[PDB]
Amino acid sequence: SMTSHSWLCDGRLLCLHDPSNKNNWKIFRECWKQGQPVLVSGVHKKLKSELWKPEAFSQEFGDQDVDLVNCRNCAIISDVKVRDFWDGFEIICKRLRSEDGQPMVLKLKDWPPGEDFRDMMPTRFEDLMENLPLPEYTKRDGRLNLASRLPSYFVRPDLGPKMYNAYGLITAEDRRVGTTNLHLDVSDAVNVMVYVGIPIGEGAHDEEVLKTIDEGDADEVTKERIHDHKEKPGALWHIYAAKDAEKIRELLRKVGEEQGQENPPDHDPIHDQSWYLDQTLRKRLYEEYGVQGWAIVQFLGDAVFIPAGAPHQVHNLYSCIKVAEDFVSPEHVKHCFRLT
């Protein structure tokens, strides 16, 4: 039967079922005040599905010049065309191949560039902003979004939204690699999964995808969502409470040293955006520092709410198109204050 919500992560993660329900705020706000992430499902049923397809981006913007990143080694592929990324998104025989002849796992860097999303893509901008959940928090002019209402004593987010466009990680060796490495944002954000591309020519490979989710420490109810309803899983997230950021720095300082890195004792390994916490490092963080995370599988149409200051990392299971909007809730405004 239809219900307002359910729980993931053994009761530690709220999952809201109706993205446009006028009463979502009554359930959301207590979890949000405690510093928890929140998941909202069903957002892709509210969008214009034809706007959010890799073939459309290629047809409309393919002649633009861009840089790509190789997810396996962080190398930059300079001055190629936007079509060189989009045309290999789902069809593996069309992907750029490395010097070993393997198809590469690529990310589109800074596209659209800076704050140009709204000017370049006005129909997509309207379709996203009118269908974001928790609109008093997430709309540019929402009554609980302080972004437009704060003086320069507060760090204000850039004008959004921002896209996260990257291929799926494939191999056993890729299991320990990040799509986006561990980092934090001083503003709150909502990240929406608007398209999942599953290759059928040499993809749609549950086997290595099921071992990744298992080893990723996904909960039993998340593991039922794969086998039962057949929704399309996009990406594996690990999110940590803002209050645990310094203990994570203490762990990565120690591991850096053990690995023969040469770093001052106050150096910030989260700000460096150089680390991915694999199964070994996540087990050490829990056992040695007492720090537990949220392991979240983001399916098509899932919106992930990421608290200001909360360290997070993402590992794409398949090729993903994600769009995110920043906001400043009153619950977390301390994270962007420039004094004490």
Ligand X SMILES: O=C(Nc1cccnc1)c1ccc(Cl)cc1Cl
Which of ligand X, Cl ion, none interacts with 132 (beta carbon under 5 to 8 A by kind)? Answer: none
Residue among 97 and 143 whose Cβ is closer to ligand X = 97
Q: Which residue is nearest to ligand X (CB)?
A: 97
The residues, ordered by sequence, that sit 6+ positions from 87 with a Cβ below 8 Å of its Cβ are 58, 62, 94
User: Shortest Cβ distance from residue 323 to Cl ion (Å)?
Assistant: 12
Q: Which residues does residue 188 pair with via DSSP β-bridges, in sequence order?
A: 327
The answer to whether 155 and 187 have CB atoms below 8 angstroms apart is yes
User: Shortest Cβ distance from residue 96 to ligand X (Å)?
Assistant: 7
Residue among 124 and 282 whose Cβ is closer to Cl ion = 124
Residue among 85 and 327 whose Cβ is closer to ligand X = 85
Residue among 33 and 97 whose Cβ is closer to ligand X = 97
Strands 106-108 vs 65-70: parallel, antiparallel or unpaired? antiparallel
Residues 124-143 interacting with Cl ion (rule: CB under 5 A)? 124, 134, 136
Residue among 225 and 282 whose Cβ is closer to Cl ion = 282
End-to-end CA distance of the chain: 50
Supply the Cα-derived Rg of the chain in whole angstroms: 20
Type and span of the H or E element at 40: strand 38-40
Residue among 97 and 211 whose Cβ is closer to ligand X = 97
Amino acid at 140: R
Residues 229-288 interacting with Cl ion (rule: CB under 5 A)? 242
Reported in sequence order, the residue ranges of 184-272 that DSSP labels E, i.e. its strands, are 188-197, 233-239
Compute φ and ψ for 220, nearest 5 degrees: -60, -40
The residue written with tokens 């986006």 in the block is 180
Which of ligand X, Cl ion, none interacts with 94 (beta carbon under 5 to 8 A by kind)? Answer: none
3-state secondary structure of 246: helix
* Residues annotated in a binding site for Fe cation: 183, 185, 312
Residue among 88 and 234 whose Cβ is closer to ligand X = 88
User: Shortest Cβ distance from residue 103 to ligand X (Å)?
Assistant: 8
Residues 92-121 interacting with ligand X (rule: CB under 6 A)? 97-99, 101
User: Shortest Cβ distance from residue 100 to Cl ion (Å)?
Assistant: 22
The residues, ordered by sequence, that sit 6+ positions from 8 with a Cβ below 8 Å of its Cβ are 15, 39, 219, 221, 222, 296
Which of ligand X, Cl ion, none interacts with 97 (beta carbon under 5 to 8 A by kind)? Answer: ligand X
Which of ligand X, Cl ion, none interacts with 149 (beta carbon under 5 to 8 A by kind)? Answer: none
Which of Cl ion, ligand X, none interacts with 35 (beta carbon under 5 to 8 A by kind)? Answer: Cl ion
Among 20, 70, 181, 274, interactor with Cl ion by CB under 5 A: 181
Residues 19-38 interacting with Cl ion (rule: CB under 5 A)? 25, 35
The rounded distance, in Å, linking the Cα atoms of 83 and 313 is 27
Which of ligand X, Cl ion, none interacts with 134 (beta carbon under 5 to 8 A by kind)? Answer: Cl ion
Which of Cl ion, ligand X, none interacts with 101 (beta carbon under 5 to 8 A by kind)? Answer: ligand X
Reported in sequence order, the residue ranges of 198-333 that DSSP labels E, i.e. its strands, are 233-239, 294-299, 303-306, 312-316, 319-327
Q: Does 26 interact with ligand X (rule: CB under 6 A)?
A: no
Count, residues near ligand X per rule CB under 6 A? 4
Among 43, 121, 196, 291, interactor with Cl ion by CB under 5 A: 121
C-alpha pair distances (Å), 327 with each of 107, 146, 179, 200, 304: 25, 7, 23, 38, 13
* Residues annotated in a binding site: 183, 185, 312
The answer to whether 184 and 245 have CB atoms below 8 angstroms apart is yes
The rounded distance, in Å, linking the Cα atoms of 183 and 9 is 21
Distance of CA 202 to the CA centre of its chain: 25
Residue among 23 and 73 whose Cβ is closer to ligand X = 73
Angle at Cα 55 formed by Cα 50 and Cα 59, nearest 5°?
Answer: 105
For binding to ligand X (CB under 6 A), which residues are involved? 97-99, 101
For binding to Cl ion (CB under 5 A), which residues are involved? 25, 35, 121, 123-124, 134, 136, 180-181, 242
